[PDB]
Design an enzyme around this catalytic site. Structure first.
Site, PDB file in Angstrom:
ATOM      1  N   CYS A  49      -1.942  10.163  -6.817  1.00 15.30           N
ATOM      2  CA  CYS A  49      -3.089  10.027  -5.920  1.00 15.30           C
ATOM      3  C   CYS A  49      -4.144  11.126  -6.150  1.00 15.30           C
ATOM      4  O   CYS A  49      -3.854  12.223  -5.913  1.00 15.30           O
ATOM      5  CB  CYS A  49      -2.697   9.995  -4.483  1.00 15.30           C
ATOM      6  SG  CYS A  49      -4.200   9.656  -3.621  1.00 15.30           S
TER       7      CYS A  49
ATOM      8  N   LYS B 104       0.844  -1.189   0.000  1.00 13.14           N
ATOM      9  CA  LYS B 104       0.000   0.000   0.000  1.00 13.14           C
ATOM     10  C   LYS B 104       0.879   1.239   0.000  1.00 13.14           C
ATOM     11  O   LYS B 104       1.826   1.302   0.800  1.00 13.14           O
ATOM     12  CB  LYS B 104      -0.888   0.026   1.284  1.00 13.14           C
ATOM     13  CG  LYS B 104      -1.605   1.377   1.578  1.00 13.14           C
ATOM     14  CD  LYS B 104      -2.777   1.557   0.626  1.00 13.14           C
ATOM     15  CE  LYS B 104      -3.281   2.982   0.538  1.00 13.14           C
ATOM     16  NZ  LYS B 104      -4.416   3.164  -0.446  1.00 13.14           N
TER      17      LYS B 104
END
Ligand SMILES: Cc1cc2nc3c(=O)[nH]c(=O)nc-3n(C[C@H](O)[C@H](O)[C@H](O)COP(=O)(O)O)c2cc1C
Ligand SMILES: Cc1cc2nc3c(=O)[nH]c(=O)nc-3n(C[C@H](O)[C@H](O)[C@H](O)COP(=O)(O)O)c2cc1C
Ligand SMILES: C=Cc1c(C(=O)O)[nH]c(=O)[nH]c1=O
Ligand SMILES: C=Cc1c(C(=O)O)[nH]c(=O)[nH]c1=O
Lengths: 313, 313
Positions: free
Chosen positions: B131, B44
């Protein structure tokens, strides 16, 4: 129960229309859209001169949508102007005319001539700032300085209410800047969200080949692939441009998709890929299906739910 | 027949791995991905300090894909570093570690500490530039001057080979500029295309509500929605970065979907949404299906068709 709308000083039987480029190139196409149950129609984006566009195959459709690199084929501005001026029956429905010149000057030249026809006939301008399929001409609305230039020059040269066809954005900062540009121009009365999702690539597994010829198979995506993109852009501009109208376009195949668009803030709802695949009979079906949803929910008019999408908490 | 690659000085049994952020947050998740038949795993994306991420619901899945605004929940870089240095069994498969600091300084601080463990253990950095779900922190790779600054400062501080997770682009000029920025950096050895399609909006028709809570329902799109966008980007970068590897991510649910990614140029193929929905058994199915398409077409190696998508004429 009622699909009627009254905006930009025109009355619409219902919010549905073709998306620019679909079933709107030729006199025959325009008569067909006029004879359909659509609320309105929009002509093919035009250039000053006629254009053949790109080599074939240049459009292909699949269960989840379409890809195209049409290359701006059109009969030229002289034709669409004449259509607006002498041919269109305005007692049937309102007409939008989309322009997409390859430079600010070409646009300005067209709108100077459109202005007296718009005054006289009530034709509405849609200025396309988002063509993704001309090589060496990335989408104008992805360059906010260019976008501001185009809108300054066109506002000045045209001096009447018009709308703009936007590409999709994918970033909150870009939504913020783009709406802000648009909000500098009081003549921009509507914002059409969205044009195709640019430069996707469909590949056929059996032939190991791209499926359109131009640009090495790269082309704009429509259809199911793009609904949530389209809904995001509609709502993003609806919330950011409270003094303007937002027209929805992208991913409409059903009354339910149209319902979501409207919830998102859409006024008019445009149909591209689905209309290309299904033909103008789609308009009676979408009308029925939207009315069914409204009846089930107790909504008697569009304005009872337009823009009323709920967020959580 | 077996699917072998030697990339980045590592050996892989097949080209499949998880997409960062799916099944890779906790020690349990990483042990799970390690025990799967995937060819590799990626952790992650992490920040210097642990993060709870956004309010729930923050992920939702549908027949055509997923929307998420997870908000970068993670156990903090100290944990992922320790997993890399002490817990991962490198004899099973390679490990990539994804970093996503919210500033150039935070990333530089992390890569300085990752460097010794990369040197000792061979863990591979994937620097996330993409992101789309932190409010007020728009995607870094949509600002080419910021992207350049990030790759200059990380290259200098890290001094070892790494890769970058890119957002999707939709405009040829952006592909040209983004690939040229990447090409200024010889330590960038792989480019992962793509992160989620940013800021879509899913609306539930019955409830008239967005389906995730953060950012007024806006979130990144993954799954069937994005496959052509993902293919486009893998191919765009594969064409423009001849001295780098391209890793494909976006819309992989089948061996055939992975075949198309590889045809477009992918060396490794990452699986997000489908892996989230189906679970780690997906990896045996994807392998079996890819091998079966290869056998029917007579391909014995990936190298024989990687990047060999055909164009028309
Ligand atoms: C064959 C084709 C031609 C198009 N031509 C135009 C055009 O001339 N001008 C324009 O603004 N958009 C054009 N579009 C984009 C559509 O107006 C629409 O924005 C896009 O297809 C997304 O809607 P959909 O998901 O319903 O297809 C075209 C789309 C297609 C598929
Ligand atoms: C729940 C969720 C979490 C994710 N977290 C990350 C992340 O930490 N880092 C990252 O680079 N990408 C992240 N992504 C993006 C995926 O890596 C991937 O790029 C995207 O989902 C597109 O692939 P797909 O179509 O297979 O889902 C995440 C995606 C999902 C759905
Ligand atoms: C006006 C050209 C366009 C075309 C086109 O004619 O190539 N296709 C699109 O999807 N959107 C456009 O804006
Ligand atoms: C690293 C955060 C990301 C996340 C997330 O943690 O919200 N979701 C994505 O789809 N992509 C990301 O890059």
């Amino acid at each position: 129960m009622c699909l009627k709308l009254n905006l930009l000083d025109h009355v619409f039987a219902n919010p549905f229309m073709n998306a620019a480029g679909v079933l709107c190139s030729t006199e025959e196409d325009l008569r067909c859209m006029t004879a359909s149950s659509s609320g309105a129609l929009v002509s093919k984006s035009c250039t000053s001169a006629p254009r053949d566009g790109n080599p074939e195959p240049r459009y292909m459709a699949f269960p989840l949508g379409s890809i195209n690199s049409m290359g701006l084929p059109n009969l030229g501005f002289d034709f669409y102007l004449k259509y607006a001026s002498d041919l269109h029956d305005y007692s049937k429905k309102p007409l939008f005319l989309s322009i997409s010149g390859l430079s600010v000057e070409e646009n300005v030249a067209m709108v100077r001539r459109l202005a007296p026809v718009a005054q006289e006939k009530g034709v509405l301008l849609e200025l396309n700032l988002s063509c993704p399929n001309v090589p060496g001409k990335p989408q104008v609305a992805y360059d906010f300085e260019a976008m501001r230039t185009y809108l300054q020059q066109v506002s000045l040269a045209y001096g009447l209410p018009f709308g703009v066809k936007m590409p999709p954005y994918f970033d909150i900062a870009h939504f913020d800047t783009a709406a802000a540009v648009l909000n500098e121009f009081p003549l921009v009365k509507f914002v059409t969200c969205v044009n195709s999702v640019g430069n996707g690539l469909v590949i056929d597994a059996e032939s190991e080949s791209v499926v359109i010829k131009p640009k090495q198979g790269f082309g704009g995506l429509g259809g199911k692939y793009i609904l949530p993109t389209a809904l995001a852009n509609v709502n993003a501009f609806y919330r950011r441009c409270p003094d303007k109208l937002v027209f929805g376009c992208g991913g409409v195949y059903s009354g339910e998709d149209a319902f979501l668009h409207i919830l998102a803030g859409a006024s008019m709802v445009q149909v591209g890929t689905a209309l290309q695949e299904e033909g103008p009979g789609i308009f009676t079906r979408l009308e029925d299906e939207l009315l069914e949803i409204m009846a089930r929910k107790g909504y008697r008019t569009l304005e009872e739910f337009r823009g009323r999408v709920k967020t959580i908490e």
